């Protein structure tokens, strides 16, 4: 594609200038390769996410079958998704976030204090993945299986179907013998009377919940630090106390939030950006691009850690909006405060970007804490 190739190495290195220039000329662009419309403006993406009867997550409504092991909260739309959405909401909001902050603060300090002895380490492998895996396991209330303590088989065909079937077996065992605390034990207690059947959709939803709370936050933590180190003065601003962590975390989500694209199936003919989107077509909300839309954010390509207001789309919108956003904020807030407790945070090599145009993240972030 002459205007946007998500996986072109030069694009992956810095996709935002490409996003910007696509937005300036074709804010609603039909991409033949991806076979989808590409919306790069905040207003269009917002409208795509807030009309489920017009833009659905259930691609069966345009007659594309859903694999049985992937029918879940994420691939259902109201009213089918409603009971599961509320059950998951109820289970999450029963969790003690203050207790989670306190124990994550401990873990972060332990990890970094051990890594402080290295001359150079990979922040992704040694912190982001380890930190976020501990957080999601504790939050859900399950223990890593001794034979796959990192859940590596499920990080992602028959192998694929076998991994998801194995994970579903673990979930059913968890549901049958819940631990003393966490989202999953609360789901079990809340399930009777929820309008949700303990069936494959529930099991699949627990699997999706785990992935939503593992790979996405891990990728964000890496992206955020990389942006702080690559933006002159950004880290020093934090070290000096010039900006508050709360606003800085929200600006980092807008600036380099990992979710780049949210696909929806068009169920009704709609005109967007002067383009005739037709029923049966796929639309992709490039929320990574929308979060740098100059119509919504002044100086959008500039990292302003004190930015206010900041109506970013990094946590989605509407019926499928993120349910773990307060956990994600605690994780980022804890990580930054823990890093700030070290006097020499600096890069120690070039970052390496994952070849992913949908969920942006780094595979290596060489770093040293001094
Ligand atoms: C920086 C971290 C995170 C970011 C940027 C993020 C972002 C998002 C976004 C954009 C969506 C919307 C997906 C869509 O509309 O299709 C979403 C959905 C979701 N997120 Fe997060 N998320 C993060 C962390 C978490 C964590 C830690 C959890 C679990 C505790 C979580 C649980 C979920 C769930 C369950 C959904 C699906 C809601 C539904 O489909 O009804 N997220 N997230
Ligand atoms: Cl402590
Ligand atoms: Cl219209
Ligand atoms: Mg730039």
Author numbering: 11 to 166, 181 to 394
Could you share sentences copied from the article?
The noncanonical cytochrome P450 enzymes RufO and TxtE catalyze the only known direct aromatic nitration reactions in nature, making them attractive model systems for the development of analogous biocatalytic and/or biomimetic reactions that proceed under mild conditions. More specifically, TxtE is responsible for the production of 4-nitro-l-Trp as a precursor to the dipeptide phytotoxin thaxtomin A, while RufO supplies 3-nitro-l-Tyr for incorporation into the heptapeptide tuberculostatic agent rufomycin. Previous studies suggest that these transformations diverge from the standard CYP catalytic cycle upon reaction of the ferric superoxo with nitric oxide (NO), likely afforded by an NO synthase directly preceding the CYPs within their respective biosynthetic gene clusters (BGCs), to yield a peroxynitrite adduct. Herein we present the first structure of RufO alongside a series of computational and biochemical studies investigating its unusual reactivity.
RufO from Streptomyces atratus was therefore expressed and purified according to methods adapted from Tomita et al. before being crystallized via vapor diffusion approaches. Generally speaking, RufO recapitulates the highly conserved CYP fold and comprises 12 α-helices (A–L) and five β-sheets (β1–4 and β6). The largest divergence can be found in the BC loop, which is commonly implicated in substrate binding by CYPs. The BC loop of RufO (residues 69–86), by contrast, displays minimal secondary structure, with helices B′ and B′′ almost undetectable. Not only does this comparatively abbreviated loop increase solvent access to the active site, but our data further indicate that it likely remains ordered in the absence of substrate. Instead, we observe unusual destabilization of the F helix (residues 153–166), located at the distal face of the Cys-coordinated heme. The ensuing FG loop is highly disordered, as is seen in all structures of wild-type TxtE solved to date, and molecular dynamics (MD) studies of the l-Trp nitrating enzyme suggest that it may play a crucial role in orientating the substrate during catalysis. Beyond differences in large-scale structural features, the active site of RufO is substantially more hydrophobic than that of TxtE. Many of the residues that form charged interactions directly with the amino and carboxylate moieties of l-Trp to promote substrate binding in TxtE (e.g., Arg59, Asn293, and Thr296) are replaced by nonpolar amino acids (e.g., Phe69, Val283, and Leu286) in RufO. In addition to changes in polarity, residues lining the substrate binding pocket of RufO are generally less bulky than those in TxtE, thereby increasing the volume of the active site by approximately 25%.
